[PDB]
């Protein structure tokens, strides 16, 4: 269940951004939440003028924004863990804007962002992640505290 692992990571991060609790997150998820939230703060400010002109009134508004930023993020076809962390950071920006701006607020639609985030990661970086050690021998080894 490669997709399921990524979905849980994406859901864990969403729940941490939304400050809602839970068993608890894995070591991998804990390391990711720390690094992604750091990247999220930068992206929110470096992308401030573009996000202000986007009002995330629906999930499909968030998905469209996600694709335009993510297909750009991997415009040149190079993958690194820094760019994968930035996917999660952008998921956090989108759930913040959706909570504030969704026309018909529905907490049950929030997890749809985690789903399309996991589909993007799996379908566009899944092979690279595998070949570079996976989440436990690649990502966590690089980013966990030394």
Coordinates of N, CA, C and O in Angstrom, one line a residue:
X1 N 0.8 -1.2 0.0 CA 0.0 0.0 0.0 C 0.9 1.3 0.0 O 0.9 2.0 1.0
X2 N 1.6 1.4 -1.1 CA 2.4 2.6 -1.3 C 1.6 3.9 -1.2 O 1.9 4.9 -0.6
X3 N 0.4 3.9 -2.0 CA -0.4 5.0 -2.0 C -0.9 5.3 -0.5 O -1.0 6.4 -0.1
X4 N -1.4 4.2 0.1 CA -1.9 4.4 1.5 C -0.9 5.0 2.5 O -1.3 5.8 3.3
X5 N 0.4 4.7 2.3 CA 1.4 5.3 3.2 C 1.5 6.8 2.9 O 1.5 7.6 3.9
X6 N 1.5 7.2 1.7 CA 1.6 8.6 1.3 C 0.3 9.3 1.7 O 0.4 10.5 2.3
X7 N -0.9 8.7 1.5 CA -2.1 9.3 2.0 C -2.1 9.6 3.5 O -2.5 10.7 3.9
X8 N -1.6 8.6 4.3 CA -1.5 8.9 5.7 C -0.6 10.0 6.0 O -0.9 10.8 6.9
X9 N 0.6 10.1 5.4 CA 1.5 11.2 5.5 C 0.8 12.5 5.2 O 0.9 13.5 6.0
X10 N 0.0 12.5 4.1 CA -0.7 13.8 3.7 C -1.8 14.1 4.7 O -2.0 15.3 5.0
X11 N -2.5 13.1 5.2 CA -3.6 13.4 6.2 C -3.0 13.8 7.5 O -3.5 14.7 8.1
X12 N -1.9 13.2 7.9 CA -1.2 13.6 9.1 C -0.8 15.1 9.1 O -1.0 15.8 10.0
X13 N -0.2 15.5 7.9 CA 0.2 16.9 7.8 C -1.0 17.8 7.8 O -1.0 18.8 8.5
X14 N -2.0 17.4 7.1 CA -3.2 18.3 7.1 C -3.8 18.5 8.5 O -4.1 19.6 8.9
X15 N -3.9 17.3 9.3 CA -4.4 17.4 10.6 C -3.4 18.3 11.5 O -3.9 19.0 12.4
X16 N -2.1 18.2 11.3 CA -1.2 19.1 12.1 C -1.4 20.6 11.7 O -1.5 21.4 12.6
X17 N -1.6 20.9 10.4 CA -1.9 22.3 10.0 C -3.2 22.8 10.6 O -3.3 23.9 11.1
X18 N -4.2 21.9 10.6 CA -5.5 22.3 11.2 C -5.6 22.2 12.7 O -6.6 22.5 13.3
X19 N -4.5 21.8 13.4 CA -4.4 21.7 14.8 C -5.4 20.7 15.4 O -6.0 20.9 16.5
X20 N -5.7 19.6 14.7 CA -6.6 18.6 15.3 C -5.8 17.4 15.6 O -4.8 17.1 14.9
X21 N -6.2 16.6 16.6 CA -5.3 15.6 17.1 C -5.5 14.2 16.5 O -5.4 14.1 15.2
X22 N -5.6 13.2 17.3 CA -5.7 11.8 16.8 C -6.3 10.9 17.9 O -5.6 10.0 18.5
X23 N -4.0 6.4 16.9 CA -2.7 6.7 17.6 C -2.0 7.9 17.0 O -2.6 8.6 16.2
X24 N -0.8 8.1 17.4 CA 0.0 9.3 16.9 C 0.8 9.1 15.7 O 0.9 7.9 15.2
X25 N 1.4 10.1 15.2 CA 2.1 10.0 13.9 C 3.4 9.2 14.0 O 4.0 9.2 15.1
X26 N 3.8 8.6 12.9 CA 5.0 7.9 12.9 C 6.2 8.8 13.0 O 6.1 10.0 12.8
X27 N 7.4 8.2 13.3 CA 8.6 9.0 13.2 C 8.7 9.7 11.9 O 9.1 10.9 11.9
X28 N 8.4 9.1 10.8 CA 8.5 9.7 9.5 C 7.6 10.9 9.4 O 8.0 12.0 8.9
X29 N 6.4 10.8 9.8 CA 5.4 11.8 9.8 C 5.9 13.0 10.7 O 5.7 14.2 10.3
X30 N 6.4 12.7 11.8 CA 6.9 13.7 12.7 C 8.0 14.5 12.1 O 8.1 15.8 12.3
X31 N 9.0 13.9 11.4 CA 10.1 14.6 10.8 C 9.5 15.5 9.6 O 9.9 16.6 9.4
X32 N 8.6 14.9 8.9 CA 8.0 15.6 7.8 C 7.2 16.9 8.2 O 7.4 17.9 7.6
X33 N 6.5 16.8 9.3 CA 5.7 17.9 9.8 C 6.6 19.1 10.1 O 6.3 20.2 9.8
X34 N 7.7 18.8 10.7 CA 8.7 19.8 11.1 C 9.3 20.5 9.9 O 9.2 21.7 9.8
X35 N 9.8 19.7 8.9 CA 10.4 20.3 7.8 C 9.4 21.0 6.8 O 9.6 22.1 6.3
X36 N 8.2 20.4 6.7 CA 7.3 20.9 5.8 C 6.7 22.2 6.3 O 6.5 23.2 5.5
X37 N 6.5 22.3 7.6 CA 6.0 23.5 8.2 C 7.0 24.7 8.0 O 6.6 25.8 7.8
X38 N 8.3 24.3 8.1 CA 9.3 25.4 7.9 C 9.2 25.9 6.4 O 9.3 27.1 6.2
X39 N 9.1 25.0 5.5 CA 9.0 25.4 4.1 C 7.7 26.1 3.8 O 7.6 27.2 3.1
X40 N 6.6 25.7 4.4 CA 5.3 26.3 4.3 C 5.3 27.8 4.6 O 4.8 28.7 3.9
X41 N 6.0 28.1 5.7 CA 6.1 29.5 6.1 C 6.8 30.4 5.0 O 6.3 31.5 4.7
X42 N 7.8 29.9 4.4 CA 8.5 30.6 3.4 C 7.7 30.8 2.1 O 7.5 31.9 1.6
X43 N 7.1 29.7 1.7 CA 6.2 29.7 0.5 C 5.1 30.6 0.6 O 4.7 31.4 -0.3
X44 N 4.4 30.6 1.8 CA 3.3 31.5 2.0 C 3.7 33.0 1.8 O 2.9 33.7 1.2
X45 N 4.9 33.3 2.2 CA 5.3 34.7 2.0 C 5.8 35.0 0.6 O 5.5 35.9 0.0
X46 N 6.7 34.1 0.1 CA 7.2 34.2 -1.3 C 6.1 34.1 -2.4 O 6.4 34.5 -3.5
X47 N 5.0 33.5 -2.0 CA 3.9 33.4 -3.0 C 2.7 34.3 -2.6 O 1.6 34.1 -3.1
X48 N 2.9 35.3 -1.7 CA 1.8 36.0 -1.1 C 1.0 36.7 -2.2 O -0.3 36.6 -2.2
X49 N 1.6 37.4 -3.1 CA 0.8 38.2 -4.1 C 0.0 37.3 -5.0 O -1.1 37.7 -5.4
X50 N 0.5 36.1 -5.3 CA -0.3 35.2 -6.2 C -1.5 34.5 -5.4 O -2.5 34.4 -6.0
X51 N -1.3 34.2 -4.2 CA -2.3 33.5 -3.4 C -3.4 34.5 -3.1 O -4.6 34.2 -3.0
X52 N -3.1 35.8 -2.9 CA -4.1 36.8 -2.6 C -5.1 37.0 -3.8 O -6.2 37.3 -3.6
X53 N -4.6 36.8 -5.0 CA -5.4 36.9 -6.1 C -6.2 35.6 -6.4 O -6.9 35.5 -7.4
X54 N -6.0 34.6 -5.6 CA -6.8 33.3 -5.7 C -7.6 33.2 -4.5 O -7.1 33.2 -3.3
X55 N -8.9 33.0 -4.7 CA -9.9 32.7 -3.6 C -10.3 31.2 -3.7 O -11.0 30.9 -4.7
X56 N -9.9 30.4 -2.7 CA -10.1 29.0 -2.8 C -11.5 28.7 -2.3 O -11.7 28.2 -1.2
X57 N -12.4 28.8 -3.2 CA -13.9 28.7 -2.9 C -14.3 27.2 -3.0 O -15.4 26.9 -2.5
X58 N -13.5 26.3 -3.5 CA -13.9 24.9 -3.6 C -12.6 24.1 -3.7 O -11.5 24.5 -3.9
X59 N -12.9 22.8 -3.5 CA -11.8 21.8 -3.6 C -11.2 21.8 -5.0 O -9.9 21.8 -5.1
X60 N -12.0 21.9 -6.0 CA -11.4 21.9 -7.4 C -10.7 23.2 -7.7 O -9.8 23.2 -8.6
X61 N -11.0 24.3 -6.9 CA -10.1 25.5 -7.0 C -8.8 25.2 -6.4 O -7.7 25.5 -7.0
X62 N -8.7 24.5 -5.3 CA -7.5 24.1 -4.7 C -6.7 23.1 -5.6 O -5.5 23.3 -5.7
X63 N -7.4 22.2 -6.2 CA -6.7 21.2 -7.0 C -6.1 21.9 -8.3 O -5.0 21.6 -8.7
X64 N -6.8 22.8 -8.9 CA -6.3 23.6 -10.0 C -5.1 24.4 -9.6 O -4.0 24.4 -10.3
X65 N -5.1 25.1 -8.4 CA -4.0 25.8 -7.9 C -2.8 24.9 -7.7 O -1.7 25.2 -8.1
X66 N -3.1 23.8 -7.1 CA -2.0 22.8 -6.8 C -1.3 22.3 -8.1 O -0.1 22.4 -8.1
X67 N -2.1 22.0 -9.1 CA -1.5 21.5 -10.3 C -0.6 22.6 -11.0 O 0.5 22.3 -11.5
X68 N -1.1 23.8 -11.0 CA -0.3 24.9 -11.7 C 1.0 25.2 -11.0 O 2.1 25.4 -11.6
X69 N 1.0 25.1 -9.6 CA 2.2 25.3 -8.9 C 3.1 24.1 -8.9 O 4.3 24.2 -9.0
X70 N 2.5 22.9 -8.8 CA 3.3 21.6 -8.8 C 3.8 21.2 -10.1 O 5.0 20.8 -10.2
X71 N 3.0 21.4 -11.2 CA 3.6 21.1 -12.5 C 4.7 22.0 -12.8 O 5.6 21.7 -13.6
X72 N 4.7 23.3 -12.3 CA 5.8 24.1 -12.4 C 6.9 23.7 -11.5 O 8.1 23.6 -11.9
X73 N 6.6 23.3 -10.3 CA 7.7 22.9 -9.3 C 8.6 21.8 -9.9 O 9.8 21.7 -9.6
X74 N 8.0 20.9 -10.7 CA 8.7 19.8 -11.4 C 8.7 20.0 -12.9 O 8.5 19.1 -13.7
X75 N 8.8 21.3 -13.3 CA 8.8 21.7 -14.7 C 9.9 21.0 -15.5 O 9.7 20.6 -16.7
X76 N 11.1 20.9 -14.9 CA 12.3 20.4 -15.5 C 12.6 18.9 -15.3 O 13.5 18.4 -15.8
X77 N 11.7 18.2 -14.6 CA 11.8 16.8 -14.4 C 12.8 16.3 -13.4 O 13.1 15.1 -13.4
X78 N 13.4 17.2 -12.6 CA 14.3 16.8 -11.6 C 13.6 16.7 -10.3 O 12.8 17.6 -9.9
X79 N 13.8 15.6 -9.5 CA 13.2 15.4 -8.2 C 14.3 15.4 -7.2 O 15.4 14.8 -7.4
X80 N 14.0 16.0 -6.1 CA 14.8 15.9 -4.9 C 13.8 16.0 -3.7 O 12.7 16.4 -3.8
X81 N 14.3 15.6 -2.5 CA 13.5 15.6 -1.3 C 13.0 16.9 -1.0 O 11.9 17.1 -0.4
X82 N 13.8 18.0 -1.2 CA 13.4 19.3 -1.0 C 12.1 19.7 -1.7 O 11.2 20.3 -1.2
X83 N 12.0 19.2 -3.0 CA 10.8 19.5 -3.8 C 9.6 18.6 -3.3 O 8.5 19.1 -3.4
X84 N 9.9 17.4 -2.8 CA 8.8 16.6 -2.3 C 8.2 17.2 -1.0 O 7.0 17.3 -0.8
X85 N 9.1 17.8 -0.1 CA 8.6 18.5 1.1 C 7.7 19.6 0.7 O 6.8 19.9 1.4
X86 N 8.1 20.3 -0.4 CA 7.4 21.5 -0.8 C 5.9 21.1 -1.3 O 5.0 22.0 -1.1
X87 N 5.7 19.9 -1.8 CA 4.4 19.4 -2.0 C 3.5 19.5 -0.8 O 2.4 20.0 -0.8
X88 N 4.0 18.9 0.3 CA 3.2 19.0 1.6 C 3.1 20.4 2.1 O 2.0 20.7 2.6
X89 N 4.1 21.2 2.0 CA 3.9 22.6 2.4 C 2.8 23.3 1.6 O 2.0 24.0 2.2
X90 N 2.7 23.0 0.3 CA 1.6 23.6 -0.5 C 0.3 23.1 -0.1 O -0.7 23.8 -0.1
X91 N 0.2 21.8 0.2 CA -1.0 21.2 0.7 C -1.5 22.0 2.0 O -2.7 22.2 2.2
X92 N -0.6 22.4 2.8 CA -0.9 23.1 4.0 C -1.5 24.5 3.7 O -2.4 25.0 4.3
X93 N -0.9 25.2 2.7 CA -1.4 26.5 2.3 C -2.8 26.3 1.7 O -3.7 27.2 2.0
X94 N -3.1 25.3 1.0 CA -4.4 25.1 0.4 C -5.4 24.8 1.4 O -6.6 25.3 1.3
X95 N -5.1 24.0 2.4 CA -6.1 23.7 3.4 C -6.4 25.0 4.3 O -7.5 25.2 4.7
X96 N -5.4 25.8 4.5 CA -5.6 27.1 5.2 C -6.6 28.0 4.4 O -7.5 28.6 5.0
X97 N -6.3 28.1 3.1 CA -7.2 28.9 2.3 C -8.6 28.3 2.2 O -9.6 29.0 2.2
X98 N -8.7 27.0 2.1 CA -10.0 26.4 1.9 C -10.8 26.5 3.2 O -12.0 26.8 3.2
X99 N -10.2 26.3 4.4 CA -10.9 26.6 5.6 C -11.5 28.0 5.7 O -12.7 28.2 6.0
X100 N -10.7 28.9 5.3 CA -11.1 30.3 5.3 C -12.1 30.7 4.2 O -13.0 31.5 4.5
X101 N -12.0 30.1 3.0 CA -12.6 30.6 1.8 C -13.6 29.7 1.2 O -14.4 30.2 0.3
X102 N -13.7 28.4 1.5 CA -14.7 27.5 0.9 C -16.1 28.1 1.1 O -16.5 28.4 2.2
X103 N -16.8 28.0 -0.1 CA -18.2 28.5 -0.1 C -19.1 27.8 0.9 O -19.7 28.4 1.8
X104 N -19.2 26.5 0.7 CA -20.0 25.7 1.6 C -19.0 24.9 2.5 O -18.6 23.8 2.2
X105 N -18.6 25.5 3.7 CA -17.6 24.8 4.5 C -18.1 23.4 4.9 O -19.3 23.2 5.2
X106 N -17.2 22.4 4.8 CA -17.5 21.0 5.1 C -16.2 20.4 5.5 O -15.3 20.2 4.6
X107 N -16.0 20.1 6.8 CA -14.8 19.5 7.2 C -14.6 18.1 6.5 O -13.4 17.7 6.4
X108 N -15.6 17.5 6.0 CA -15.4 16.2 5.3 C -14.8 16.3 3.9 O -14.4 15.3 3.4
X109 N -14.8 17.5 3.3 CA -14.1 17.7 2.1 C -12.6 17.9 2.2 O -11.9 17.8 1.2
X110 N -12.2 18.2 3.4 CA -10.8 18.6 3.6 C -9.8 17.4 3.1 O -8.8 17.7 2.5
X111 N -10.2 16.2 3.5 CA -9.4 15.0 3.2 C -9.3 14.8 1.7 O -8.5 14.0 1.2
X112 N -10.1 15.5 0.8 CA -10.0 15.3 -0.6 C -8.7 16.0 -1.1 O -8.1 15.6 -2.1
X113 N -8.2 17.0 -0.3 CA -6.9 17.5 -0.6 C -5.8 16.5 -0.4 O -4.9 16.3 -1.2
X114 N -5.9 15.8 0.8 CA -4.9 14.7 1.0 C -4.9 13.7 -0.1 O -3.8 13.1 -0.5
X115 N -6.1 13.4 -0.6 CA -6.1 12.3 -1.7 C -5.4 12.8 -2.9 O -4.7 12.1 -3.5
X116 N -5.7 14.0 -3.4 CA -5.1 14.4 -4.6 C -3.7 14.7 -4.4 O -2.9 14.6 -5.4
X117 N -3.3 15.1 -3.2 CA -1.8 15.3 -2.9 C -1.1 13.9 -3.0 O -0.1 13.8 -3.7
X118 N -1.7 12.9 -2.5 CA -1.1 11.6 -2.5 C -1.1 11.0 -4.0 O -0.1 10.4 -4.4
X119 N -2.1 11.2 -4.7 CA -2.1 10.8 -6.1 C -1.0 11.5 -6.9 O -0.3 10.9 -7.7
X120 N -0.8 12.8 -6.6 CA 0.3 13.5 -7.4 C 1.7 13.0 -7.0 O 2.5 12.7 -7.9
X121 N 1.9 12.8 -5.7 CA 3.2 12.3 -5.2 C 3.4 10.9 -5.8 O 4.5 10.6 -6.3
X122 N 2.4 10.0 -5.7 CA 2.6 8.7 -6.2 C 2.9 8.6 -7.7 O 3.8 8.0 -8.1
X123 N 2.1 9.4 -8.4 CA 2.1 9.3 -9.9 C 3.3 10.1 -10.5 O 3.6 9.7 -11.6
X124 N 3.9 11.0 -9.8 CA 4.9 11.8 -10.4 C 6.3 11.7 -9.7 O 7.3 12.0 -10.3
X125 N 6.3 11.2 -8.4 CA 7.6 11.0 -7.7 C 7.7 9.7 -7.1 O 8.7 9.4 -6.5
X126 N 6.7 8.8 -7.2 CA 6.7 7.5 -6.5 C 7.9 6.7 -6.9 O 8.6 6.1 -6.0
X127 N 8.3 6.6 -8.2 CA 9.4 5.8 -8.6 C 10.7 6.4 -8.1 O 11.6 5.6 -7.6
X128 N 10.9 7.7 -8.2 CA 12.1 8.3 -7.6 C 12.2 8.0 -6.1 O 13.3 7.8 -5.7
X129 N 11.1 8.2 -5.4 CA 11.2 7.9 -4.0 C 11.7 6.5 -3.6 O 12.6 6.4 -2.8
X130 N 11.1 5.5 -4.3 CA 11.5 4.2 -4.1 C 13.0 4.0 -4.4 O 13.8 3.5 -3.5
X131 N 13.5 4.5 -5.6 CA 14.9 4.3 -5.9 C 15.8 5.0 -5.1 O 17.0 4.8 -5.1
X132 N 15.3 6.0 -4.3 CA 16.2 6.8 -3.4 C 16.0 6.5 -1.9 O 16.3 7.3 -1.1
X133 N 15.5 5.3 -1.6 CA 15.5 4.8 -0.3 C 14.1 4.8 0.4 O 14.0 4.3 1.5
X134 N 13.1 5.3 -0.3 CA 11.8 5.4 0.3 C 11.8 6.4 1.4 O 12.7 7.3 1.6
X135 N 10.6 6.4 2.2 CA 10.5 7.4 3.2 C 11.4 7.1 4.4 O 11.8 8.0 5.1
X136 N 11.6 5.8 4.7 CA 12.3 5.5 5.9 C 13.9 5.4 5.7 O 14.6 5.8 6.6
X137 N 14.3 5.0 4.5 CA 15.8 5.0 4.2 C 16.2 6.1 3.4 O 17.4 6.3 3.1
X138 N 15.3 6.9 2.9 CA 15.7 8.1 2.1 C 15.4 9.3 2.9 O 16.3 10.0 3.4
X139 N 14.1 9.6 3.0 CA 13.6 10.9 3.5 C 14.1 11.1 5.0 O 14.8 12.0 5.3
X140 N 13.7 10.1 5.8 CA 13.9 10.2 7.2 C 15.4 10.3 7.5 O 15.9 11.0 8.4
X141 N 16.2 9.4 6.8 CA 17.6 9.4 7.0 C 18.3 10.8 6.7 O 19.2 11.2 7.4
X142 N 17.8 11.5 5.7 CA 18.3 12.8 5.3 C 17.9 13.9 6.3 O 18.7 14.7 6.6
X143 N 16.6 13.8 6.7 CA 16.0 15.0 7.4 C 15.9 14.8 8.9 O 15.6 15.8 9.6
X144 N 16.0 13.6 9.5 CA 15.8 13.4 10.9 C 17.0 14.2 11.6 O 18.0 14.4 11.0
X145 N 16.8 14.6 12.8 CA 17.8 15.3 13.6 C 19.0 14.3 13.7 O 18.9 13.1 13.9
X146 N 20.2 14.9 13.6 CA 21.5 14.1 13.8 C 21.9 14.2 15.2 O 21.3 14.9 16.0

